[PDB]
Design a binder for these strands. Sequence first.
DNA 1: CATCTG
DNA 2: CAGATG
Length: 327
Amino acid sequence: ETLNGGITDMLTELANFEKNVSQAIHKYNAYRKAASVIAKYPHKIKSGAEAKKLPGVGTKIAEKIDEFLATGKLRKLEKIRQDDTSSSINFLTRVSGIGPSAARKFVDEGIKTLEDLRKNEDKLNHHQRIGLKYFGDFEKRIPREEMLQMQDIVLNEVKKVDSEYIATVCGSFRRGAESSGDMDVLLTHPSFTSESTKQPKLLHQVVEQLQKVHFITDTLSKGETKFMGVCQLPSKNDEKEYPHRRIDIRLIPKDQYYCGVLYFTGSDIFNKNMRAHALEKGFTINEYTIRPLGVTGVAGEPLPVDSEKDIFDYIQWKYREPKDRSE
DNA sequence: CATCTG
DNA sequence: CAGATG
Ligand code: NA
Ligand code: NA
Ligand SMILES: [Zn+2]
Ligand SMILES: [Zn+2]
């Protein structure tokens, strides 16, 4: 956690670049298990060979550790931080809609910067476009003070459209958090469930309403269950307009809402621990359900949940306020 | 994983 | 449809 930090960090840089710049997934994948194991390792790595000793650690990685250990740096790492081509792919990727794949193409094309991007607004697709238009805004964190306003509006409008709508803003925003990055709404409706064959409208009506009143600004991707958008808090009395904010809404069958709710609220760490315990207790839990673990190895069947309460209870746990859902 | 693109 | 993004 700090004894083998830089090692695990360099390893991380290495893995990353393998993937993003070159295409070396195996390689990339290599740096990763390595950094994981070294990460878990209880002693101070004092040398290459010492490490090598570990699983995942081989020759080439050891090689590197040595150098890194021997001196405060790593040539390759140093060469990678200069190389503009590398650098670009890191940058270009910054744009919502621009993954690595794409980052490579543009670069081979010459588009390396934001301007490059503007001038070439043709080569970009819709998402990529919005991405570009809201670059700065996109990167701005969302202070909860705005989160509440948002949340305010969202829930009021969802309500108007149908009283049976159950919406919930998960995320860290849900776990206390002073600021978030994006806004994720979990949505279900009584008339939506596991068997119940579809009902697209269920998600479309609200989307509409949102944009009706202007909270939703653009559409990123909009399917039958997931909608990816842009939204914004109505600029008050002109002088201070809001930034554009990422937002996602998703329809879930009412019969697997809280698992998800729980699920989405996190943290990952809370999840695990709960997941592990769930297992002791003789159960299993995932994004959508909780199930009684048979003995034959495994086994299924959905347990019937009506709140995050029903879940814990099951695992015979202490109900945890979302704030203390941390770890 | 669900959506888009081409 | 395979492949990309989030
Ligand atoms: Na991107
Ligand atoms: Na293939
Ligand atoms: Zn030791
Ligand atoms: Zn989100």
